[PDB]
Design a protein around this ligand. Structure first.
Ligand SMILES: Cc1cc2nc3c(=O)[nH]c(=O)nc-3n(C[C@H](O)[C@H](O)[C@H](O)COP(=O)(O)OP(=O)(O)OC[C@H]3O[C@@H](n4cnc5c(N)ncnc54)[C@H](O)[C@@H]3O)c2cc1C
Ligand SMILES: Cc1cc2nc3c(=O)[nH]c(=O)nc-3n(C[C@H](O)[C@H](O)[C@H](O)COP(=O)(O)OP(=O)(O)OC[C@H]3O[C@@H](n4cnc5c(N)ncnc54)[C@H](O)[C@@H]3O)c2cc1C
Lengths: 520, 530
């Protein structure tokens, strides 16, 4: 393998592009649009084949918990990021790794067909007329938050509903919805952001759910980003090992510290599930202010109103917003290639079509982890480039089919059977999976004997992307360094005004048990 | 006394108006503007002689912690309120007590002058031509968040600063300031609300302070409003009695639960002070997002930039906003009457000019308590109507002057010497002061041999306005009731989605864990005779 194709200059495109030149492959990037970023490049209109965002989106993951393993975000960056500002990182990245030269913009990939397999033929239209070409391998990075899902079938009377309705996709700005009566269906992270945003200047906003999530702020312990508090090796273990109830018993408590979810009305049904909680710093407040009313699932619609699953009714609702998420297709692909059946994607680790005989194509970024996607797709590409070169090997088709089932089977009893969780996956565990396959997973215990400082920090502290550039192939020296100095780059954009100026309670109770244990 | 004048149809006007008809006085209300509410009536332009608000203001006190003692907010109201919605309560109130008939709108009070004292002569212009009249007593309710303070003298180079600047007062909407570099001066509750609002669609927002407050969310324990968790008789006592540090040591911890204030950069200088913390549910987040940068005090301005007290500089700042608060005047009053000198208002309990020989005039609402103003001005008016009638008596001038000093002296060592705290006052303590004067303050000790349920609830639970309509004059039956059922009226607008599930096995955590540890101490304490 040498000549590699990457579909889209997404985040996933941009990192694979880079992970290629690192394994010395020579890649070609095809971008439908005129620029990089994919979803995170905000545009005012909703252009086809690209994922839209509303203008005000902020990331739900820390910069030091979601940068590429060898490229910390500038120290002067905020810890959570406007879409504006994330883009900037991406641009800074593609400048610093000269990845822009491999990109062909406004060239959309129409078909990816197998030649007599170990290569692929790829048709791509440009200005009207459509060239073809041949590649040894191909990495798909065309995203999956593009094709809206609106299950109107399950909302009867929608046919009768006068007034306006649309899908989260189509939203961009709140202006236009001044003082209207607005029903948003579902408790997406997006639904929440939307609800909140519209709620300010709107008559009323409702927000339907049967299930109703746990809501959680990006702020955590001592105002540090939640991901660095929650995503820590040691903690992940406890979540895995402890009896599921003991864990649920703990989520319940931790989650309710902010507010009683029963009272605010979004207490879940099955707390059994480790379903992704929504990340909105604004929602609980906006509920107190009465800007938003949470509500049970819509049962039926009328021309002006909505009946609900708990018998209540909401009169004169001017606007419905279906934040009912997206589905996904690969309209340029053998329909048997990315087989998606009975609430299960048959791809070895959300990546490799198992029925292939030469392992020369993989989907990157077709995954929804519980941490940042950016370090996941980086590792996804470290694995995949090395597979392509042969440095790494897949198992048998029958082994790969056994995994796929067993994974997705656990996945189900861990996040429920909804086709909005197909791609849900525990965060660290998966990073580890990918890192093992290329032997970049640090062996913490082994790091006890040498550098017990690191050993501790890696286990008990926050699990950064940096950790994975410690051992195995492609290392970064600034990895020990990055990890040790993250606190600095966190506080740097925060502690922006300075004063200049449990101390003895800690010394005492420790010594007082050093008195307990000694006087024997 | 009978014919009473109330200057302004503020909240203060509207409650006194009511407190009058309750003591059978016949009042006349003079309203500069065309409608009630004063500050809380949002209008698009900043109309003179009335306090302006930006359009998006939300009350920073609970509905059940800030309703009038005998008029709960409707159950279907949210717990914190848009200005839009608070007005509604006020309107509902003035309808239910027929207070609207006493109001003369678009009649502004030009002078209040003493006749041969025990009455007052009051000139009021209407449409052009200005009638005079006479009243036995007069209650001033013209507010004090109207006259902007902008100490430009202390911000040198402001003369040189090109680009735009103005005062909090004149703010209304954020649209217009898209992607600009905006410096707001001070950490007002307002500054914060403004900063936050502008910050969303702005290039950058900074926010200057030397001192820098504690920031606090309206959300508290178990998502209940902060005021009902903080303003509780029992707790107030601990704050009063415990060594001031022990109390500071406690505020510091409680406050930082949300976030480390050192790290976010608004750690205060003197934590010694029980200074009012800002109430913004948005500010800490908006700092994480980097929408707002906190900064030390401005030292100097240039045409395009700002130097700062810690040597830093911020280039290309398009807009300064002075959220540097308000002062206050009474332009229709004897200059000797409301004497305001050396960081001290000489009014007996922020109310009565002591040099008066007949006690026939009082200011209501010239006070900034640490809880809701609405129950304070209600009690302010219960005291005052009764003074006017003679049912209640002031002490001597020399006694009233001794209090005033002693109060304002404590006030200083409790909130610092800044002329932005003149009117600061502990919340419950003051409610008690006013209630005592008319003997409506419940005695709990007594109230423990009868209704120990109430006795507990009153002390340990949240100190509502309702409490004060339990004893003394003007009672409400729906007072025991209101208090007992408040949890309902709180949850009613919240718990709007409901599970339906008798939780034993799946989710009833500290139900049996409480049963166990209580029985396990019923084992601890008993097993001494075995
Ligand atoms: C509201 C929201 C918030 C999120 N927040 C976070 C967060 O805080 N942290 C985090 O880690 N993740 C987050 N994510 C997830 C993740 O970052 C995004 O899904 C991510 O942008 C996906 O990037 P991608 O490159 O895989 O897809 P995209 O960015 O959509 O890339 C698709 C690219 O492919 C191009 N394309 C499509 N079809 C073709 C074709 N035939 N030929 C050529 N080009 C084509 C498009 O033009 C586009 O440039 C969030 C997602 C959402 C919806
Ligand atoms: C931003 C902000 C938020 C606040 N939030 C809260 C809160 O959440 N909870 C709380 O308890 N308190 C709060 N307060 C404190 C308090 O509610 C307000 O200060 C409120 O204005 C008090 O009303 P008032 O009647 O004293 O004064 P105002 O409402 O200012 O009364 C002025 C009225 O008198 C009239 N008037 C003035 N001069 C004359 C004249 N010469 N003749 C006739 N009429 C005249 C005016 O036209 C107007 O009708 C807040 C204050 C501010 C600034």
């Amino acid at each position: 393998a040498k000549k590699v194709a990457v579909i889209g200059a997404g985040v996933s495109g941009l990192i694979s592009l880079k992970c290629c030149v690192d394994e010395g492959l020579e890649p070609t990037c095809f971008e439908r649009t005129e620029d990089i970023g994919g979803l995170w490049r905000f545009k005012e209109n909703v252009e086809d084949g690209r994922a839209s965002i509303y203008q005000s989106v902020i990331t739900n993951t820390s910069k030091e918990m979601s940068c590429f393993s060898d490229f910390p975000m500038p120290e002067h960056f905020p810890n959570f990021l406007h879409n504006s500002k994330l883009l900037e990182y991406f641009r800074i990245f593609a400048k610093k790794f000269d990845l822009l030269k491999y990109i062909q913009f406004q060239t959309t990939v129409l078909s990816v067909k197998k030649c007599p397999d170990g290569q692929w033929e790829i048709v791509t239209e440009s200005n009207g007329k459509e060239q073809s070409a041949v590649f040894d391998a191909v990495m798909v990075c065309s995203g999956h938050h593009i094709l809206p899902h609106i299950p109107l079938q399950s909302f009867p009377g929608i046919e009768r509903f006068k007034g306006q309705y649309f899908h989260s996709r189509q939203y961009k700005h709140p202006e236009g919805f001044e003082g209207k009566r607005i029903l948003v269906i579902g408790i997406g992270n997006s639904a929440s952001d939307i609800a909140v945003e519209l709620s300010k200047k709107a008559a009323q906003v409702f927000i339907s759910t049967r299930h109703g999530s746990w809501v959680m702020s990006r702020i955590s312990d001592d105002g540090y980003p939640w991901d660095m508090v929650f995503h820590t090796r040691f903690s992940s273990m406890l979540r895995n090992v402890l009896p599921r109830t003991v864990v649920k018993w703990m989520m319940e408590q931790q989650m309710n510290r902010w507010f009683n979810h029963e009272n605010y009305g979004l207490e879940p049904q099955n707390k059994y599930l480790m379903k992704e909680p929504v990340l909105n710093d604004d929602l609980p407040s906006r509920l107190l202010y009465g800007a938003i009313k949470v509500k049970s699932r819509v049962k039926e619609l009328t021309e002006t109103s909505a009946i609900f699953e708990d018998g209540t009714v909401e009169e004169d609702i001017d606007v419905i917003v279906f934040a009912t998420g997206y589905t996904f297709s690969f309209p340029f692909l053998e329909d048997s290639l990315v087989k998606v059946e009975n609430n299960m994607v048959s791809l070895y680790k959300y990546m490799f079509p198992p029925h292939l005989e030469k392992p020369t194509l993989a989907c990157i970024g077709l995954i929804q982890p519980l941490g940042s996607i950016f370090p996941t797709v980086e590792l996804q590409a470290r694995w995949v480039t090395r597979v392509f070169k042969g440095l790494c090997t897949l198992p048998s088709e029958s082994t790969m089919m056994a995994d796929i089932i067993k994974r997705n089977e656990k996945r189900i009893d861990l996040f429920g059977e909804s086709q909005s969780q197909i791609l849900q996956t525990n965060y660290i565990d998966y990073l580890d999976e990918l890192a093992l396959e290329i032997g970049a997973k640090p062996d913490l215990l082994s790091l006890l004997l040498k550098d017990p400082k690191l050993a501790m920090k890696l286990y008990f502290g926050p699990c950064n992307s940096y950790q994975y550039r410690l051992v195995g192939p492609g290392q970064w020296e600034g990895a020990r360094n990055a990890i040790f100095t993250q606190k600095q780059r966190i506080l740097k954009p925060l502690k922006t005004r300075a004063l200049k100026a449990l101390l003895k309670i800690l010394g005492l109770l420790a010594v007082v048990v050093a008195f307990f244990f000694q006087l024997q």
